[PDB]
């Protein structure tokens, strides 16, 4: 599902080494190591990211994310 | 405050835009030649707007003259449009703080974001065509529009009119490219990916250009300027960043690197990588 | 062969560990993690990238890409 | 606990490969490798961070940090 | 020997996971993965790089490079 | 000890996968790979770096300060 599309309001490095972003008022975590710099770069430049996951409730995990310029 | 944007000729159109800019903004000391500058919008209280009367869609004719745009002054956003024949202000949902006296205000369910407008319009800005003919069509669509929810044709009309008014006010590049469509040849202006990127980076540009002191270049995300003529040929009016659009994160507008003024956040976003071997093998 | 040349319109990491970029209206993917920061930096700085591959069909994988400031 | 919220006043790479940041006048170290460039980029752009740890005295360790847009 | 000194004219990720840069009209490749993002940063920022190698023929390999600002 | 303090005058990736920086007229190298991006970033953004070491050759402690 398309869970959230928006700018990253904050990011957090978690105790379990996963990485959380808050997008459109909801928090999503990912364990994908490749995504950590990319997500911070998106936060730094105000990229619109699209978080896709099988569940979209705040606190859901994700592995799929699109990085847009618009 | 009311201004006319007159589409009769390239002269009348550029004259209209220049008059608006002169009234609502002040040139940057370090990006100004003659009376052609990058200018900073003068501070107005929140909710202040100016009106733009659309004229000259039919060259030099007093017809198609019932469209007015309401523009929030501090950010140049189009808050909605007025049918002056019906005295009705159709106002986007993100502008409930914009109060216009004397008109019937129709509060719309539709917000003014480009995401929303492009969706409802079934029209992407990248590759969007604008001509005198489609501005007349847009005008008619907006005069026919009624109700609280934007239609496809009303949204297409707003995409076209915002591009050739507010976005051209911001970007001399868009002014220059679009104005060819107003000539007797009546060519088509096609909005480019670069045009779109400029509009999307307006806030970031606005935060960086006040720091410019004659560096050899300016880099703001995907936007690059190599000299003052590129800056002036591209940008005309920026936000007053001394608005929420001025800041993404952090508090450092720029870093000078090798005589280029970088948006600090851009540099940070490619200097945050760890050792490549460790990155790629740590799956 | 030169498959696509232009700025990166969007990039996307997929649950199946592929990284898609769209260049000049065409989508290609790579699973080289080396290319994820390189491509995303190219996207956020407006580099012109040239996607190169033996064959250039849509949805093709790639692992050769040139980066130009202009 | 949220120990310190503010900009990174300095950062330091340590002999034991941990990484120290000074935030709100107190020093904190982390052994999370991935935090090293993320903190340095936050530092260079003046990004506000929130250090989270069991103990908040200067010299405490952390494994969790929030990157804010303040 | 100093093979080439100047700004990076283009860079290119190669299918064998090596990385090519063109400097002062000559092309050199490296198999050192750590150099890929560093060279990209240099290219983005207009660093002057000095390619150093025992073989300076264009198309040759390198694993030593100096980075200078203006 | 603070071996050197100042801006990075140049950096260099070496054939043995170490990394050299010149600071305040003196050259130092490190074998820690994650210091390679950290140092180059400091060099590009104009950070003051303080190279620290028991003997002031190789280092693996360095402080970064914005200018």
Numbering used by the authors:
A (entry chain D), C (entry chain E), D (entry chain C), E (entry chain F): 1 to 70
B (entry chain A): 1 to 242, 257 to 297
F (entry chain B): 1 to 56, 60 to 70
Provide the authors' original text about this structure.
To elucidate the precise manner by which these shorter peptides bind to Stx2a, X-ray crystallography analysis was performed with co-crystals of each peptide and the Stx2a holotoxin, which were obtained via the soaking method. We were able to determine electron densities for AR4A-mono, R4A-mono, R3A-mono, and R2A-mono, and X-ray crystal structures were solved to final resolutions of 1.80, 1.80, 1.90, and 1.75 Å-resolution, respectively. These structures reveal that the AR4A-mono, R4A-mono, R3A-mono, and R2A-mono peptides bind tightly to the catalytic A-subunit. In all cases, the common Arg8-Arg9-Ala10 motif (numbering reflects residue position in full-length MMβA-mono) interacts equally with the Glu72, Tyr77, Val78, Asp94, Ser112, Tyr114, Thr115, Glu167, Arg170, Thr199, and Gly203 residues present in the catalytic pocket of the A-subunit, whereas the Arg8 and Arg9 residues of the motif electrostatically interact with Glu167 and Asp94, respectively. The amide group of the Ala10, but not its side chain, interacts with the Val78, Ser112 and Arg170 residues. Overall, we find that the binding patterns of these shorter peptides are almost identical to that of MMβA-mono. Combined with results from the competition assay, these data demonstrate that these shorter peptides efficiently bind to the A-subunit of Stx2a, and R2A-mono is the minimal essential motif needed for binding. Using X-ray crystal structural analysis, we clearly show direct binding between R2A-mono and the A-subunit, in a manner that is identical to that of the Arg8-Arg9-Ala10 region of full-length MMβA-mono. We found that R4-mono, AR4A-mono, R4A-mono, and R3-mono exhibit greater inhibitory effects (relative IC50 values = 0.387, 2.27, 2.70, and 3.68 µM, respectively) than non-tagged MMβA-mono (relative IC50 = 8.14 µM), which was used as a positive control to compete the binding. Notably, R3A-mono and R2A-mono (relative IC50 values = 89.6 and 132 µM, respectively) also substantially inhibit binding, albeit with efficacies less than that of MMβA-mono. All peptides, including R2A-mono, were found to efficiently inhibit Stx2a toxicity, confirming that R2A-mono, which is a minimal essential motif for binding, is sufficient for effective inhibition of Stx2a.
